[PDB]
């Protein structure tokens, strides 16, 4: 159940952006899910705060939750679309893809 | 219930590091907790991926979870302690304090 990156595919169709975007159809967005608890393995990228907090937790659940499995690195994407005026454009949306997850 | 930073204080005593550390006793570590769902207000710092994912979710819960409320910025700390040999030292532990949370 450990914290890891999972697959997720966005079809512009789904989001309704079906219309303006020439390309692509959709993309690989991915998503972070899993648990952050000991063993906090290294390829599970935990910060220091994550350990303390994972630990305090263990001493005192009521006190504090485990850290959440969130994305540690994001990659931008580029879609080509028809703005108004009917100019064909290229936009770079940043922070759209998840590259890596971890306990933070 | 919205995603925000909360107070948390670590007493070196609790962690057992009671002994080697001259100073401080403990510190303000803070922790991120709360929900990531619309309204994804701005002072709730959400990435793009966070919106898509918050949205896909809403279309298809089964499909994907809301983003998790994780710390967006960390601050290091310095503790003064007795290493072996009985040298009094100053260490900077990085990423110990949470400065800010948000939906990522």
String of DSSP letters for B56-95: HHHH-GGG-PPPPEEEEEEEEEEEEEE-GGG-EEEEEEEE
Residue B67 phi, psi dihedral angles, 5° rounding: -60, 155
Q: Cα–chain-centroid distance for residue B97?
A: 7
Contact at CB, B55 and A15, closer than 8 angstroms? yes
Cα separations in angstroms, A94 against A73, B28, B43, B51, B75: 11, 33, 19, 12, 25
DSSP label at residue A46: B
Measured distance CA(B94)–CA(B97) in Å, rounded:
8
The boundaries of the domain holding residue A39 are 1-104
If you search the block for the tokens 């899993």, which residue do you land on? A34
Which residue in B40, B52, B64, B74 has the most chain A C-beta atoms within 10 A of its own C-beta, making it the best mutation to test that interface? B52
- CATH number of B60's domain: 2.10.90.10
Measured distance CA(B16)–CA(B10) in Å, rounded:
11
Closest CA to A32 of A97, A77, A93: A97
Measured distance CA(B6)–CA(A7) in Å, rounded:
31
The domain total for chain B is 1
- DSSP three-state, residue A65: coil
Contact at CB, A71 and B104, closer than 8 angstroms? yes
Q: How many CB pairs under 8 A join A and B?
A: 84
Q: How many CB atoms lie within 10 A of CB A62?
A: 5
Contacts of A51 in chain B (CB under 8 A): none
* Technique used to solve these coordinates: X-ray
């Amino acid at each position: 159940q450990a914290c890891k990156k999972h697959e997720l595919y966005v079809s512009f169709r789904d989001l309704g952006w079906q219309d303006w975007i020439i390309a692509p159809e959709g993309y690989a967005a991915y998503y972070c899910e899993g648990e952050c608890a000991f063993p906090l393995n290294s390829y599970m990228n935990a910060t220091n705060h994550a350990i303390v907090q994972t630990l305090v937790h263990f001493i005192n659940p009521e006190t504090v939750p485990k850290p959440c499995c969130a994305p540690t690195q994001l990659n931008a994407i580029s879609v080509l679309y028809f703005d108004d005026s009917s100019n064909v454009i290229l936009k770079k949306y940043r922070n759209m893809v998840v590259r890596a997850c971890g306990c933070h």
